[PDB]
């Protein structure tokens, strides 16, 4: 797992470390990006993969 | 018995064709191609040069804001003292066009206690209870104000999402494209679409003077609560200066003719239904006439309110600088025409009353009606199996497919597979397991048993009634 | 009356569509077969086949990435375009009313 | 798949608007230990098995 | 089985035979491809360089100025005074032709209220409010009108309305250059105001490899709202018949069709004089008398036009001036629908002779039996299509251009059965009566109107196999 | 004994279908996509947005010669067959008879391509084989049967190189002369390829009509040849099945000729017997051509190692085809036996009894609605066909109806083409096959079905 980052600014660099640093060329059996929305004006949650 | 028939059918006959006349005169020649063009001028042409995107592909609020400084000033202001504008060179520009936005306040939606710490706004769906009323930004003119709905001379809408108040923030633009455009990038700048907004609308007219047709156009752009943009259009035709041409007087002397029958109709059904016959109801050819009836005076009502309120245009031509409301007049306009269509459409079905001349019209009317109780009987059924599909196919399919998306949806949808009108991708792709199920169940139940039941009792009811006609002639 | 037939009339229409998917599977073998051959040639066997999936072959009315997901899927769409064959379950039907 | 992250998803997480985050996001990868060969281009159509 | 049936059928199959030849000899491949390369020549081609519009997708004057200038004169004038061939085979006859028509400023009634902003209106065409006096440099004949008679032309019967063959008109030149300064002067003096109701462009060619002249005319028609609707027409002819011995053959087989003809009509005479006075009883006789109509007609329309040909001569005579080939074209469509019409009538009667066993009779007595109730329900059914078709019109008739005229409002109806309509457009131009609509009629079509159909034509054909059972049997 | 002859029939079926399975997924149809897509689909040039499926002018094929021919030829990867060839057929001046009011303003017109036509005479610089007429069989060729016409298949011919610069400097001389005037009729190009990393050969024929009006008219033709190599077990078990098919193809003619021997003439009244002999002589004509097409390997692979000359491996790919067009209708065929075999219950026994009592009534009323079929196809092909692409040819009008009928109408075109006449031939063409026409043969059926009912109910009450 990697949490890509917290602020805008360092998620950059997170993502270019995992880009420069054999992170996903050589063996990537999946990506496995998943996110999560909350709609308080009509109260729905949605699990976005 | 039949001299008295001979009479009525003269009298239907005169009426149809009164009828027929009045509708040719109010559908007149082509007038599809002055909202075609209006349409195609409006709606296709893209918001920019680079970009691809037009009014009916809307996607985010930019692209509502570069829509109208943009295709709508270029479609709007056509050049020839600060001179009118004509649009096609023949369609002419009434006083100046007017926008307008609803909004709601912040504050209308409670969050959970428990996240009341990294989110502290949240806007509540459109509702009269939770719109704003107060001014915001830099409050100078109407644009930051609210005005109320009696104040705008405004109505509601009905629009996709929801049904919008006539009130709101409205703003007149003006005459020249320069004057229009400074208003829009001053409307801009300081921020007027924020994330409060929920809907819009824009609103004008044009006149053509070639023929004598005005034209009504409103536009609206919707801003749900979840995000995204729908766009919906309105392009009315409508003649407010009827009397002009000797055409004009025909069709006013056929509509006081088309007046004079259905107070003659009305006359007769009162006169029948009071002597004899109180319950009078047990025929269903009486049903239609009091349908008909009921549609011909309510469109009558509907005439008189709506010919006789022309005041705005009379308060417009004494000053052609304001935004003349013509939204009122294309309303009654709509209901106008669906309910001339449904009486000339049920007026028309009326004629299988005298069609019985020989042994083979009246032996089919015989079947058909013997025959209709068995179908309203197997069609109950029908109809149950067919809700069970469609209220299956809306809470499975109903939050991914954009086609099963409301009940009414559903229902159509299913029609048109009747039709072999559907595409399986997406059905299939929403669901890999019970998606081919729905889809090989509804059809293979729906034509090949419920299409040949229908057959089956149609054939028997026709097959009795031919085969009795013949034995009690040929026994005789 | 109306359910009561469609009991007693069950083991025909099973009979029906037992005939229809036998000729069915034959047919889709002879298309099988005969479409994949070769490049246009405008020839007979292309006129033969041009009775079915619109334009002498669209792979089966289902792309044939589609066609390997759910081929009861494709089963039903070559069901509704061909509903005439149904038909004959009326042939049934009608007598036992 | 970089690329598109730093274009369109990293703006779309930091980039406050409507539907609240409700917790940062992450990526998981599955290794497989396997590392696996590049075939020759075929029909294609793989089952990756 | 006797001798006056085999000889009435001797006679019918080398009718349907003179028939079949004289049809396969006027259809022939090449003709197709002629006018598809003329087509994609000059209809897809776009306007310029720079824009993507071609002729198919004109949408403003300006877009009509630009193809005139652009795809046109490339189309029409290749390069080896010297003569232009089209596709090195497509010799351009003569000079092309342009003409417009125009209505008259106050051909109105402006209402009195708003007579005070706008100043001039033109009505739609017609004939009786049309132009007929001089503007702009009034010295040349794109100036000038000339009537009808003095253009010896013709109506058309455009898209909106039915144009007359007079209106304002030049002749173009035979070289580019010509034609473009021409154009450009015509284009410099305004020459289509806000009047201009409609504009033609005419011209032929000849393709002598094989022989058959191709004449095409193009319109652009413009309404009273604002807006282009373009239109075209090519169309090929043969006016050199015999120039091979398959045109002798052809002509040999046109004699003998209309000796056939001759003796038909004089057979037919000849019964209804006393013998079954009124034999109009009968299908076999009313199919007679329709096809010896529609073969006399055709016939009088081959000799009245064949013997039409002063004006090959006249522009033979003199090769610089422009070809009146439209007479030509309208009477060779004519022709070309009443022998189609005539031929698919001759095929049907072959139902005549098809009884040689007993299961041939008994589906020809089945489908005798049937025409009765079949057209009793007939007019039901289309009372309610009709019914339906204006419901859809008054309803949709302004905005789906499915239904935007009665006509196309059955077309669509018709349509609809097959279910190749898109249904998004009619959802959108009325949320409610609308669906309604669709809905009821596709369930009135498909569960109440075709079984029932099918019930008539199920109970007739038991009953008729019944009766001849009985009649067969009890001998 | 019906039960013994039951696992007979199942185990020809499973054979015949592990010989189904063997074909359908021998993907051959894959490399035939992508080359054709390496050929057709690459345009000429990059400045230049036009490929062989939209070929317009002369010097679109011009360009297409040096340009993605050349690119595609001489590049997974193919290795050549020798060199290819390129041939054009054409026509003489004076074919062509002017008529005499015109005949001074046009001096040169060229007939429509026919073998009295043709052109037989030296042009050009006489100096090899591209500009004399050679006899057809001096090439070894045949007619074609091309788009609007059948070729001869003499013309003038021209046998490329094996090196992309000797094969573009031959074009470029080609083009310096003009070799393609306006007697120009047809263009052929012709080669052979065998993509060295798989086990397969094909023969590639590319052809460019001039029409006697103008512009061109492209076509292609792509043919896969395999040969057979064994290399697994799944080879080997592949030969099994086809030896064990030639030895059930034996045991079903030895029981034939069996029966045969004491039924003289009372074999052919049925019909479970005469699809058997249809079958037999179908497997017997099929098993003949593919061990008569597998005695040329030899031939083929003779010429991949140095040979500079053409190879015609034409009628090989003829009978490539006919097999393949073959093994098709025999199993359809025994598909159909299957229908046969499926008697177990009344159910099946009653509705196999009204389609046998139905058949001739359905034939009769078949007989009618192809008269009535055609005499509509005549009247479209007479009305739109020559302006609507699909009515060109009475073929393409049968199709188009027969499309209709399944609901695939277009109706702009037809509605263009003719405003009145065009749809009053649509709207009564729907209205007597989707509601007369074809509402007969559920007649026929639904009487038969009734009779059959009645006759065994009858049966069974005194049974
Ligand atoms: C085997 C080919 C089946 C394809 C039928 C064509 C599809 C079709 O739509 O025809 C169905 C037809 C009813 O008319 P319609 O559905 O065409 O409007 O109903 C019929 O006419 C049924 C006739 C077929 C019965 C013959 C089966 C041996
Ligand atoms: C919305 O209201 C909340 C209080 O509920 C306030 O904290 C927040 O700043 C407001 N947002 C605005 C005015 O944009
Ligand atoms: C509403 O109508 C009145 C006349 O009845 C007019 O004076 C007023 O200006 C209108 N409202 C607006 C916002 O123009
Ligand atoms: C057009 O007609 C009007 C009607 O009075 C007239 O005033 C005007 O001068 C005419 N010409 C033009 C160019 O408007
Ligand atoms: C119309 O036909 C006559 C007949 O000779 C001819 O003289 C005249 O020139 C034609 N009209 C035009 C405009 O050429
Ligand atoms: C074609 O033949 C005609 C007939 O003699 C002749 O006049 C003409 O010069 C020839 N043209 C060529 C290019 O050979
Ligand atoms: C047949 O062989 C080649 C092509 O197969 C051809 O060029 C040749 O002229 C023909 N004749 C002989 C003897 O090779």
């Known amino acids: 797992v990697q949490e890509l980052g917290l602020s805008l600014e360092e998620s950059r660099d997170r993502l270019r470390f995992l880009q420069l640093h054999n992170w996903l060329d050589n063996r990537s059996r999946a990506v496995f990006l998943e996110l999560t929305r909350y709609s308080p004006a009509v109260g729905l949650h949605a699990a976005v993969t | 018995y039949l001299k008295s028939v001979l009479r009525e059918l003269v009298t239907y006959l005169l009426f149809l064709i009164v009828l027929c006349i009045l509708t040719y005169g109010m559908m007149s020649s082509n007038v599809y191609y002055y909202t075609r063009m209006m349409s195609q001028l409006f709606l296709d042409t893209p918001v920019s040069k680079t970009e691809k995107t037009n009014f009916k592909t809307l996607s985010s609020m930019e692209d509502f804001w570069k829509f109208t400084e943009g295709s709508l000033l270029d479609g709007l202001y056509w050049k020839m003292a600060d001179n009118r504008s004509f649009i096609f060179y023949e369609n002419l520009l009434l006083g100046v066009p007017r926008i307008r936005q609803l909004r709601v306040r912040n504050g209308s939606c409670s969050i959970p206690q428990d996240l009341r710490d990294e989110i502290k706004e949240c806007y509540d769906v459109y509702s009269v209870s939770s719109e704003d009323r107060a001014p915001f930004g830099p409050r100078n003119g109407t644009a930051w104000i609210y005005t109320s709905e009696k104040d705008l001379n405004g109505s509601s809408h009905w629009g996709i999402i929801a049904t919008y108040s006539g009130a709101g923030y409205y703003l007149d633009l003006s005459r020249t494209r320069e004057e229009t455009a400074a208003q829009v990038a001053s409307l801009k700048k300081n921020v007027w679409l924020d994330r409060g907004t929920r809907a819009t609308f824009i609103d004008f007219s044009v006149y053509n003077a070639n023929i004598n047709l005005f034209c009504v156009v409103r536009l609206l752009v919707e801003f749900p609560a979840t995000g995204g943009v729908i766009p919906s259009w309105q392009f009315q035709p409508l003649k407010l200066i009827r009397y002009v041409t000797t055409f004009d007087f025909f069709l006013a002397a056929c509509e006081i003719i088309f007046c004079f029958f259905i107070f003659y109709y009305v006359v007769e059904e009162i006169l029948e239904i009071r002597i004899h016959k109180l319950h009078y109801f047990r025929s269903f050819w009486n049903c239609l006439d009091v349908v008909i009836v009921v549609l011909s005076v309510v469109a009558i009502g509907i005439n008189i309110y709506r010919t006789s309120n022309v005041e705005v245009l009379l308060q417009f031509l004494e000053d052609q600088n304001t935004f003349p409301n013509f939204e009122h007049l294309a309303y009654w306009q709509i209901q106008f025409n669906n309910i001339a269509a449904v009486t000339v459409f049920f007026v028309w079905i009326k004629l299988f009353k005298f069609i019985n001349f020989n042994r083979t019209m009246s032996q089919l009317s015989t079947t058909m009606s013997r025959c209709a109780k068995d179908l309203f009987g197997f069609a109950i059924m029908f109809f149950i199996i067919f809700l069970a599909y469609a209220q299956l196919a809306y809470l499975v399919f109903g939050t991914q497919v954009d086609d099963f998306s409301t009940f009414q949806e559903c229902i159509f949808t299913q029609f048109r597979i009747i039709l072999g009108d559907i595409n399986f991708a997406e059905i299939e792709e929403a669901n890999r397991v019970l998606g081919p199920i729905y889809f090989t169940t509804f059809v293979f139940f729906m034509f090949f048993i419920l299409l040949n039941m229908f057959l089956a009792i149609i054939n028997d009811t026709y097959s009795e009634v031919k085969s009795d006609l013949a034995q009690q002639k040929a026994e005789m | 009356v109306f359910g009561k037939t469609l009991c007693r009339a069950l083991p025909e229409l099973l009979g029906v569509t037992l005939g229809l998917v036998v000729l069915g599977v034959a047919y889709a073998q002879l298309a099988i077969l005969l479409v994949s051959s070769c490049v246009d040639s405008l020839w007979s066997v292309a006129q033969a086949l041009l009775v079915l999936c619109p334009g002498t072959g669209l792979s089966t009315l289902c792309p044939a990435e589609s066609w390997h997901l759910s081929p009861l899927l494709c089963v039903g769409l070559w069901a509704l375009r061909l509903w005439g064959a149904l038909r004959l379950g009326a042939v049934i039907l009608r007598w036992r009313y | ?49």
């Open chain 4, 1 to 49: 798949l970089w690329p598109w992250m730093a274009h369109v998803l990293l703006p779309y997480v930091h980039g406050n608007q409507s539907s609240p985050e409700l917790g940062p996001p992450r990526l998981r990868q599955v290794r497989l230990q396997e590392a696996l060969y590049p075939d020759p281009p075929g029909p294609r159509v793989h089952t990756c098995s």
